[PDB]
Structure 1
């Protein structure tokens, strides 16, 4: 087989969630996740006479600490028959030796597993910040529930009352709702991330377009996320004080492509909220000889004998995407 260090990939393509909110990382050296282990917040030390000693504080961490990490591993073989994906400026003279062929196939595979697991970590983040709830269910795995702690006041639905659809899209102003739905924000909001038609029925109201700062030049540096994710991330501009992004990402399900965001939804919050990417242990003795229990991902190539005379190149990981404040975002169920 090939050594573990055959991972010259070092590519960051986080789908707008592992690169905007959750930009802080935390691996563990334990099977479960102890949320209390995270330091947490500070609490404004108080006045004291300058003769006596202090009242040294620790912030005591968080209370609930018994969740289960997202252990995942996808399977592929390196059957030296697959057609090589053509790349620009390729010297075809090396196609004779299988040493180049299999080496290239392995690297393409590693790309495949990383892009596959990026989708699942993204959808965990999406499940986290759209309802507060999260459900890790799957075959060869037990059903697991995760409650972030979101209040009922952060999942407002447009179905009740007068909706954005059954209105006059030429005289009604849409702002009256956004601050009314962003008052319960627990922080200043500047991101109004929109679904494909979520921004459509929103634009239809004429009051949007005249003050919508459509100029490319703006203050928020969100344009960075534009140049990397030029497919599913569209930066509309400024709504005045807040920024607007429309998301059209997809995930490859068992046989079909499915949209990340449910169509009639929207989310409001701050661009600098805190998001955890807790990682559990790697459950491979092969790692415990090398002590790589605290890592992001774990690649491994081997050749198996006996009945299945094949060989594999695996990547195992355990993301358990979490949110520091389940109440710093508000989800509008559009209608």
Structure 2
């Protein structure tokens, strides 16, 4: 059992979703998300006559304001019985210390913990901006469908009508489809991040390959983001006007591993779409009596006396991240 302050990572490397589209964090002192409580977009046009001023403007009463945040509280043991991750030859005598082994093993345990919540949050993000629906579900828990409201024109499919696979691999240009799906996106699209084989049949067209610019032509901080997360986001290059990226991230589930992304999917939208990170109550007596009922995360190291007389690291959170405008992204399944 070590203090709360032993929670230093400086490792925030989420794959460009919770850090770039979903910056809009709202931890609450209350259980649910109350979209009426969030101001979101403000009623933002009307003025008043040059004699007096008008009424009082409020948070404009969101129609649906009741969903259950994913209160996730996992834990692990940091029992000093293992040989640990030994960074090359930094004096294993301190590993021989139970104190250093226990502290850096709580380091390792907790980092596994937040990357676990981060990967489940990224699955929530990919569900969110791929269908507008999120499955708040788990065993011994009712499945609540949390819908931002993704429209039908945001779910139009490439296989409908003519498929890119069922097209000329040399002369056909899918740019026409690119603006066709981008027009009904309530904004400009500046990233065309694909799943791998989706980008494969996208680039199979020649027009794509002599239309794209392999050069840097550094447009924004997206190159810096790729250099940071050189793991699963791949900056293919410029398609001229728009940036071409491929995400091949993978989640390692209970017995097997598989990619986050489905077979062939796309979301057309902006890099500055508004993403909410509403956070529920944290059900920990420590959190309430020290005021961490409204926060992002909560770690603790703590000893059980009695039957499971041991010591554990416990991580608690409650995210219900969504997208403010589901119509911002057009979600297309590809050929």
TM-score (norm 1): 0.96
User: Is the 8 Å Cα contact of residues 42 and 60 (structure 2) preserved in structure 1?
Assistant: no
Deviation by residue 1:259-305 (Cα, 9 ceiling, x = unmatched):
10101111110111100111111011121121111111111111112
User: Cα–Cα, structure 1 residues 105 and 49, in superposed 2: closer, same or farther, change >3 Å?
Assistant: closer
* C-alpha distance in 2 between matches for 1:59 and 1:2: 42
- Whether the 8 Å contact between 1:280 and 1:318 is mirrored in structure 2 is yes
Report if the CA contact (8 A) 1:220-1:243 is conserved.
Answer: no
* 8 Å CA contact 2:216, 2:238 repeated in 1: no
Identify if the C-alpha distance between structure 1 residues 140 and 169 changes in structure 2 by more than 3 Å, giving closer, same or farther.
same
Deviation digits for residues 66-87 of structure 1, max 9, x if unmatched? 1111101122111211221011
C-alpha separation between the residues in 2 aligned to 1:47 and 1:127?
Answer: 40
Q: CA deviation at 1:179?
A: 0.5
| Contact 1:199–1:246 (Cα < 8 Å) also in 2 | yes
Deviation digits for residues 11-59 of structure 1 (CA, Å, limit 9, x no counterpart): 1111121122112211101011111111122334435432233233224
Partners of 1:47 and 1:136 in 2: how far apart?
41
* Contact 1:198–1:263, Cα closer than 8 Å, also in 2: yes
SS in 2 for 1:30: coil
Tell me if the contact between 2:86 and 2:92 (Cα under 8 Å) persists in the aligned partners: no
Aligned to 2:77: 77
Runs ≥4 in structure 1, deviation > 4 angstroms? none
CA–CA separation in structure 1 for the residues paired with 2:48 and 2:126: 45
- SS of the residue 2:258 aligns to: strand
Check the 8 A contact 2:156/2:331 in 1, yes or no.
yes
Q: Report what 1:114 is aligned to.
A: 114
Whether the 8 Å CA contact 1:78–1:312 is kept in 2: the answer is yes
Please say if residues 73 and 316 of structure 1, whose CA atoms lie closer than 8 Å, have aligned partners that are also in contact.
Answer: yes
**Number of residue pairs aligned between Structure 1 and Structure 2:** 335
Residue 143 (structure 1) shift: 1.4
- Give, in whole Å, the separation in 2 of the partners of 1:202 and 1:128: 23
Which is worse superposed, 117-126 or 12-21?
12-21
1:87 alignment partner, SS class: coil
Alignment partner, residue 48 of structure 1? 48
Aligned counterparts of 2:52 and 2:244: Cα–Cα separation in 1: 53
Aligned residues of 2:16 and 2:225 also touching (Cα < 8 A)? yes
Shift in alpha-carbon separation, 1:117–1:49, aligned structure 2, 3 A? closer
Partner deviation per Cα, 1:292-328 (whole Å, 9 max, x = no partner):
1111111111111222222211101001011110100
**Structure 2 vs 1, CA of residues 118 and 46 (structure 1 numbering), >3 Å: closer, same or farther?**
closer
Given that residues 164 and 201 in structure 1 are in contact (C-alpha distance below 8 angstroms), is that contact kept between their aligned partners in structure 2? yes
Greater alpha carbon shift after TM alignment, 230-239 vs 52-61: 52-61
The Cα shift of 1:168 comes to 1.2
1:189-236 CA-partner distances (Å, limit 9, x unpaired): 111110100100110100011121111132132112201210100012
- Higher mean alpha-carbon deviation, 176-185 vs 94-103, is at 94-103
SS in 2 for 1:143: strand
- 2:330 and 2:168 map into 1 onto residues whose CA distance is 25
- Cα contact 1:193–1:266 (8 A) shared by 2: yes
Displacement, 1:164?
Answer: 0.6
**Kindly tell me: are residues 221 and 305 of structure 1, through their superposed partners in 2, closer, same or farther at Cα, counting changes over 3 Å?**
same
Alignment RMSD (CA, Å): 1.4
Moved more, 16-25 or 243-252: 16-25
CA deviation vs aligned residue, 1:152-196 (integer Å, no higher than 9, x gap): 110111221110101110111111111111111111111111010
Separation in structure 2 between the aligned mates of residue 142 and residue 35 of structure 1, nearest angstrom? 21
Query: In the TM superposition, what is the alpha-carbon distance from 1:60 to its structure 2 partner?
Result: 1.4
For the 8 Å contact 1:212–1:240, the answer to whether it is kept is: yes
- Alpha-carbon shift at residue 89 of structure 1 (Å): 4.9
Secondary structure in 2 matching 1:47: coil
Whether the aligned pair in 2 keeps the contact of 1:4 and 1:301 (CA below 8 Å) is yes
Asked if structure 2 preserves the Cα contact closer than 8 Å seen for 1:218 and 1:237, the reply is no
